Design a protein around this ligand. Structure first.
Ligand code: NBJ
Ligand code: ZN
Length: 270
């Protein structure tokens, strides 16, 4: 009765949550998704027909980042409404808290793809309100299940902050975050703050301007590392160069990242 399984690319993926595709679409065993234009279909037969006809081989919009075979496309919800709606319905299969699927005009979508000779294969995305009253640099962020915990979420988080830096703004993900989202942000913040502390020294305000991480997220991260003291109503960094190195040598920071090469990012504040 609900969509419980999708086929996209060469992946079949079980659903995690309800997503409000039309009811007739939920009645089948599977939904079949074109991995390039994200059209969803009811039957393997219409999917195969679509595959031989569809001419798209990458997301719409502008490629604002390209390094080697890693690419990010910026898609304006107002310019590519159907695609962005398709994207939000797919994302809702794996996000508990996302609530906006059809009114996509106030959002811009950053699509992460992995390119090979056949085309640019979607890995995940994050959305961003064009005008955030509460200073969120991410509204929702989603990595497709078979790509999770493989460095792609870390890339997208870093990417969202590289945009904030170009905007001369601090930003924060819209809350609530998933379990994995909490872990991923905490670990991204810890790495970024510890590398900055090793490289220089710095106030909490200094770190915020260098990283675009909000002062609250910095404070809560430093508290979980136990590197902040409290003095007459103010949080003050309290860290020795050696303790920073003992943290950075820890095994969790051992996997080599997909980095965001600032030189490969083509984007100006809107
Ligand atoms: O895939 C995930 N996160 N995994 S990670 O890219 O390996 C990673 C490693 C270190 C630090 C941060 C990271 F995100 C993942 C999946 C869905 C939503 C989100 I939000 C993240
Ligand atoms: Zn298509």
């Amino acid at each position: 009765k609900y969509v419980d399984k999708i086929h996209i690319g060469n992946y079949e993926i079980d659903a995690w949550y309800f997503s409000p595709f039309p009811e007739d679409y939920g009645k089948q065993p599977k939904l079949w998704l074109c991995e390039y234009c994200l059209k969803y279909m009811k039957y393997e037969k219409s999917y195969r027909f679509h595959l031989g006809q569809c001419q798209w081989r990458q997301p719409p919009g502008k490629e604002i980042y390209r390094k080697s075979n890693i690419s990010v496309h910026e898609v304006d919800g107002k310019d590519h409404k159907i695609y962005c709606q398709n994207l939000c319905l797919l994302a809702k299969l794996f996000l508990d808290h996302k609530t906006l699927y059809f009114d996509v005009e106030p959002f811009v979508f950053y699509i992460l793809t992995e390119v090979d000779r056949q085309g640019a294969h979607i890995v995940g995305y994050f959305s961003k309100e064009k005008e955030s009253p509460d200073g969120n640099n991410v509204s929702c962020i989603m990595i497709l299940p078979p790509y999770q915990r493989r460095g792609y979420g870390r890339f997208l988080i870093a990417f969202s902050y590289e945009l904030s830096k170009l905007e001369s703004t601090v930003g924060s993900p819209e809350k609530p975050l998933s379990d994995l989202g909490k872990l991923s942000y905490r670990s991204y913040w810890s790495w970024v703050l510890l590398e900055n502390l090793r490289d220089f020294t710095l106030s909490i305000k200094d770190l915020s301007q260098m990283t675009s991480i909000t002062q609250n997220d910095i404070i809560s991260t430093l508290q979980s590392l136990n590197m902040v003291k409290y003095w007459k109503g103010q949080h003050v960094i309290c860290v020795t160069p050696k303790l920073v190195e003992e943290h950075l040598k820890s095994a969790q920071y051992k996997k080599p990242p997909i980095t965001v090469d600032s030189v490969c990012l083509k984007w100006a504040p809107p």
